[PDB]
Design a protein around this ligand. Structure first.
Ligand code: CL
Ligand code: CL
Ligand code: CL
Ligand code: CL
Ligand code: CL
Ligand code: CL
Ligand code: NA
Lengths: 255, 257, 260, 253
């Protein structure tokens, strides 16, 4: 099942879409500068691009870490990003009441992994009618994602993306089960599956070289998109991902 | 570090405290009946007791599933439990705005494991000044429980209970690391550690397994045991707790080495 | 099901048996000195005791690390331990051909975890008719132990002990699933289950306090025995204090009927 | 570091080598038939090929289950495979004393994962001087493979292949850490790394899974693949080769 996000087609058989940006919105000027860099590199390679940022991030590592500019200013910034670059945007929500006003502006709304069982939030997100990115908890098996999907369906929204972020592996560490992508596709109606490589590595060319190996591995399994918190470095990385993706997506799925 | 909860002393070298009750509040009369049974059993065995229940099941598998009586009716039921039996109570909270009204009534407020990184909820819980029960996420190592403790300390509340509920073990299965209790004591300032045996087992009769697991955890010298009955059958409660108390008494009588 | 090992009754409802000793037999006099300490302490507390050591340690951290005294001298040392102290002994075997000579001398023979799928070894061990200790691999689930037991049964030997040593938990780390003991009892005909606390902790960074916590926890589930190693591994002088606490818990647990 | 195996170059920046065959040797004719199919498919796709089989099933569910032809008959069959097809072969050894006679015939000898810490077997294997395939235990971290390599080096053999077979993931299940390949390269002197897809999946249709997993691992840039595996082998290898050729043509970053 494909999802149209303005002029982008997101689907496990379509050219991969990059989801990237910055962690938390600080100002219009800094957001535009970072967005402009992603836009320039992705335009140069022809890769569809969706800008990601939080306006109020509720799960930072310290209680006094800046959570972002907040809803009202955050949405003004997203409006300007959309107007300037003509791209879709994605942000996370954690309060039911925030879902509607965010969905006026942001093309995709993201359900944080740890909140993915929270019924009130799921319902409020579903009822926006927007495209939703469901972050897969590290403690949920891929065959259980169908249960979250079911709750969105009961609440009237099928425009759902499944986002892999790794699985708990002993203490501290995460492993990405490359078989889980296929299990999600088979059990969840071939909804678009995207790969959050950055979180999948947080517990581990150094880190750059790891992120490349892990991203290539995941994309080899035929995915709708790649998701980062992460210059000539981005360009070189995307060149390699686009090469693999083009090869994979050009071949028919097996008989 | 011990914590006083009314007349109860909760601590890792004190007689164990039972946090027991039910999954979700459904009605006044059924709650009072179940609570009466826990009270009469615990009082005769001389085990300190705190009644547990949720007023809302916030994360059920269907949007149409029964969720419980809800906050307003739930707090009325807890007020009646306290007035009738004179015991402390514990319940979980899922949103910041609920923390102040719940804390006015409920002696211990609980941080659900999946929500333990939500800064807004940690701050709202901390600011109540109530005793807080921190459910340890299944995906968090025992040496990282200190990170959750740190956040509560930064928000000005040190009356914290660390509650084991198992660790993720492959897909859809949990294992309880009996060594993690010690790690949590050593790295979190010897705050009271309790063991949620019920949720530790949910992924795998079960009566015999609950007893074996509970006895194993309590062997490591813990402040308390956390469990649910309807979950153990309610009539086996007395026999179960006779065994747990026999082991706790023995362990607690041996000098720490 | 109980197993008699000379005058010792080994079983999940009997007073726990200590299997203890050393990693590798390296000398006569030092072995006897270590054994003498375990004997003195276990006699003092009334705990049944079986002396454990390897005569050939197959899994050394370097290839030229001393393997141990080898089969022929190793068996002589075991004979001396038996003659001097009057206790049973346990050792591991690695090859079919070693099963008969080791079984003539040793009261229990042990199937190393990594070798537990080797059919030739399982048959040769079974055919000795000796009591066998089966080490549970860290990568085998407790419900799979029955398949090793089945093979011993097909080969005509039911005098089997099942020995927990932990389960793989992420990379280079072990957890002991306290529920596995019960799964093994239920699926393997209530054969004696013992706990190797030493090898269950090898991947953890003191260590004395960990060994005690882990040992108590396991013994709380009602087990036939505890399996450990010391060095002159627990320090050998702390043995009495450790065993006092284990015996206290075991006596309490064992004195209460199983809860139906 | 590359390893020459007759005319094949095995290395993490070389075209991938397929190691494939059957579980256990049962008879000459059935072995030749299976080998012929692999040879025909790999030749027409231009993929270097090493035939794999066990002469002994050391590891069965009944004491009365079939064990395979055994060492002496097994080595006769391997000699015939080599003579007929002119390809290298690989087999596993489980006891020190088998290492020299097996190594006289088989180009690559394989150290079973469960036996990888058995010092006597490591030394006996090393002393043959043959190419050795070291199966990574499902319980060992990739950064610990360097300690096995060190033992083979101390024993005088550096012609070592590291082989991924998955990692224990709770009870009765395996997961493959796609980051472990890189860790093994970085810490073990860029010895060839190959991927045993078959044994990585044994605890998990299945054909589609094997393809996804094989594509994912080969994306990390590897020397070779194990595939025990309508024309399924051919269809699978076509896709693997396309991805391998692409990956191997990109400069290392
Ligand atoms: Cl998560
Ligand atoms: Cl709870
Ligand atoms: Cl959890
Ligand atoms: Cl041992
Ligand atoms: Cl093992
Ligand atoms: Cl293995
Ligand atoms: Na004997």
């Amino acid at each position: 099942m494909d999802i149209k996000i303005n002029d982008i087609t997101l689907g496990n058989n379509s050219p991969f879409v990059l989801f990237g940006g910055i962690n938390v919105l600080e100002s219009l000027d800094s957001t535009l500068q970072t967005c402009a860099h992603y836009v320039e590199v992705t335009r140069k390679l022809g890769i569809p691009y969706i800008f990601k940022a939080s306006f109020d991030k509720a799960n930072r590592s310290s209680i006094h870490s800046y959570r972002g500019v907040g809803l009202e200013e955050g949405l003004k910034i997203f409006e300007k990003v959309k107007a300037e670059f003509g791209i879709p945007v994605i942000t996370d929500v954690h309060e039911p009441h925030q879902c509607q006003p965010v969905a006026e502006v942001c093309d995709v709304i993201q359900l944080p992994a740890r909140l993915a069982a929270q019924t009130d939030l799921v319902v409020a997100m579903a009822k926006t009618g927007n495209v939703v990115n469901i972050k897969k908890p590290q403690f949920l098996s891929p065959s259980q994602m169908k249960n979250i999907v079911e709750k969105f369906h009961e609440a009237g929204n099928g425009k759902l993306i499944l986002c892999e972020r790794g699985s708990s592996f002993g203490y501290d560490n995460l492993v990405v089960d490359m078989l889980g992508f296929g299990v999600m596709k088979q059990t969840c109606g071939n909804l678009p599956v995207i790969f959050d490589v950055t979180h999948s590595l947080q517990t581990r060319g150094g880190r750059r070289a790891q992120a490349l190996d892990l991203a290539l591995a995941g994309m080899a399994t035929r995915l709708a998109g790649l998701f980062l918190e992460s210059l000539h470095l981005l360009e070189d990385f995307l060149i390699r991902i686009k090469a693999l993706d083009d090869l994979i997506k050009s071949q028919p799925i097996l008989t």
